[PDB]
UniProtKB/TrEMBL annotation, chains A, B:
This is BH3976 protein.
Length: 90, 90
């Protein structure tokens, strides 16, 4: 078995590696929120591939601007976190 | 500010809610890996929307089968986790 990152087309992998570096430097500092963000970007990329898009058609040429639009807050993480607890009750 | 989940088209939100329930019952039990998986599915959905796809064009009609293909292992989480540490050095 292998990481789904390794299953991306090569172009997508190159841009993902740029992304990991960037987000480390400007994204959430916390390990878990950091991986949540990365996981999310990975899914953009996976659906991009499946849709027959080139990576820059997903991010645009300004990849940092793409990342920046997902870091504006942590409401998204917070939602997913709170929902999982509400369930773990179940 | 609001969760990006709330910014999805309504059809995508409906299928995401089905997904949260399903994954809770069959997905990783661990809180963090669970949110990582959810984050990833969310990105599939976000790129689906941006690409002009209907949700079932992203998941297929067998939504449980879609979820099942992302739960076959945790190599993907493990990768993202190990990479973040290697960096937090930096």
């Amino acid at each position: 078995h292998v990481s789904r990152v390794e299953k991306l087309p090569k172009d997508y992998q190159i841009v993902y590696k740029e992304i990991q570096k960037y987000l480390f430097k400007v994204g959430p500092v916390e390990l878990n929120e950091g991986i949540g963000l990365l996981s999310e970007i990975l899914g953009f990329f996976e659906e991009g591939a499946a849709a027959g898009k080139g990576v820059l058609d997903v991010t645009g040429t300004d990849v940092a601007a793409f990342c920046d639009a997902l870091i504006g807050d942590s409401k998204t993480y917070a939602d997913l976190y709170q929902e999982s607890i509400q369930q773990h009750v179940d």
